[PDB]
Amino acid sequence: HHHLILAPMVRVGTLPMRLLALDYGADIVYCEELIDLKMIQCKRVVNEVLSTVDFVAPDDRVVFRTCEREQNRVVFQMGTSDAERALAVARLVENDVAGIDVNMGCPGGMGAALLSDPDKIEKILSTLVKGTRRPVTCKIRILPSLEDTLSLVKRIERTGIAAIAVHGRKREERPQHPVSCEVIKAIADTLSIPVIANGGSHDHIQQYSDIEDFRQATAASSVMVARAAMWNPSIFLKEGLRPLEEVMQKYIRYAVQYDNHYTNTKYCLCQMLREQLESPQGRLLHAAKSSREICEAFGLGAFYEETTQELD
């Protein structure tokens, strides 16, 4: 049995999508990238009302929210360009998450910008590996040189990281451009640690059975799914895809139970609906100025009132 992983995604990877991905059969769920500069301003707050652990910023904004359900399966992804600041964040969240990931693939010089400075990647990763009891991973995009990609990947493993997620595309290579299954394979063979294949959503993964095909084509230990999970989170379901109306109902119920900010809920729903945003329901969703108005657009107004009342 191989591992089905929810890839990190800014705005999409909040608590409601993570819980929904686990319900549909994901083994590991990554959260959206969170910048170290915001996280170092946060306090850990135990929320007895929602039964969540909250990481609250000085402006009273909840930056990260987790719960007992994802406790052993959530991977905290951070945006960092400083080893001490990275460890400060890991020490804040380590008791509430299952792993620590560092973005090395993004477009303040943190993501794919790090790929050019292997000395900085080496400093950041070793500091985290030595400083936390949690498995450290990272997520990279490939380099323009196959020699430099392979050189960097062996350098990354040497820091003592648990696994490496490989997005089989170079920085500047648009999603239009196909994924490099060959470059992921060359990496998976040369490494002793597990390699997580990533990058084949529209072109390779349209159904559950295609995930195994992509793991074979790349010779990786597991596959990480982003866009296909964003479009329909039931991509993890072995039995087949579920109707979107059904998935969206389950999405909103989680967003209300866990007091997700309505603009975030709205965003994730627009990503699922995409062409259906011109339907009367899509028009109503676009117009929604609150969580109550989102539930109204989806016949969940009764559910919202009963949850809001039971929460207050």
Residue 292 Cβ, how far from ligand FMN at the closest point, in Å? 26
In the bound state with ligand FMN, the residue whose beta carbon lies nearer, of 124 and 295, is: 124
Closer CB to ligand FMN, 34 or 297, in the complex: 34
Closer to ligand FMN by CB, 55 or 304: give it.
55
Is 236 within 8 Å of 208 (Cβ atoms)? Answer: yes
The footprint of ligand FMN on this chain (CB under 6 A) covers a number of residues equal to 21
Question: Smaller CB distance to ligand FMN: residue 226 or 300?
Answer: 226
Question: Buried b / exposed e across 249-271, counting CB within 10 Å, b at 16+?
Answer: ebbbbbbbbbbbebebbbebbeb
Per rule CB under 6 A, is residue 200 in the interface with ligand FMN? yes
In the complex, minimum distance from the CB of residue 306 to ligand FMN, in angstroms, rounded to a whole number: 32
How far apart are the C-alpha atoms of 241 and 193, rounded to whole Å? 32
Give me 298's structure tokens.
């989806």
Determine the 3-state secondary structure of 242 from DSSP: coil
**Which has the closest alpha carbon to 114: 68, 159, 65, 152?**
152
CA–CA distances in Å: residue 38 to residues 80, 181, 187, 226, 276: 11, 35, 33, 24, 35
198 is a contact residue toward ligand FMN (CB under 6 A): yes
What is the DSSP track for 259-275? T--HHHHHHHHHHHHGG
Among 6, 12, 156, 217, binds ligand FMN (CB under 6 A): 12
Instruction: Report the phi/psi class of residue 194: left, alpha or beta, with left for phi > 0 and alpha for psi in -120 to 50.
Output: beta
Closest CA to 307 of 255, 272, 236: 255
Restricted to residues 43-102, the positions that interact with ligand FMN (CB under 6 A) are 77
The answer to whether residue 233 forms part of the interface with ligand FMN (CB under 6 A) is no
211 binds ligand FMN (CB under 6 A): no
Q: Which residues contact 125 (CB under 8 A, 6 or more apart)?
A: 102, 136, 138, 156, 159, 160, 161
- Positions marked catalytic: 106
Question: Shortest distance, CB of residue 253 to ligand FMN, whole angstroms?
Answer: 22
Q: Which of residues 14-33 bind ligand FMN (CB under 6 A)?
A: 32-33
Taking CB under 6 A as the criterion, the residue among 197, 199, 237, 248 binding ligand FMN is 199
- Does residue 222 interact with ligand FMN by CB under 6 A? no
* Structure tokens given for 273: 């609906």
Is residue 227 a contact point for ligand FMN (CB under 6 A)? yes
The answer to the question of whether 9 is labelled as a binding residue is: yes
Question: Contact with ligand FMN (CB under 6 A): which of 132, 201, 232, 291?
Answer: 201
Task: Tell me: is residue 8 an annotated ligand-binding position.
Answer: yes
| Environment class of 123 (CB within 10 Å of its CB; exposed 0-12, middle 13-18, buried 19+) | middle
Is 39 annotated in a binding site? The answer is no
The Cα–Cα gap between 137 and 139 comes to 7
* Residue 153 among known ligand-binding residues: no
Identify the residue among 4, 5, 6, 9 touching ligand FMN (CB under 6 A): 9
Among 134, 139, 171, 266, binds ligand FMN (CB under 6 A): 139
Most distant pair of Cα atoms in the chain: their distance: 60
**Annotation-wise, does 18 bind a ligand?**
no
Query: What is the token pair recorded at 16?
Result: 């409601």
Is residue 110 marked as binding? no
**Bind-site residues for FMN:** 8-10, 33, 77, 139, 167, 198-200, 226-227
| Residues at the interface with ligand FMN (CB under 6 A) | 7-10, 12, 32-33, 77, 103, 105, 139, 167, 198-201, 225-228, 230
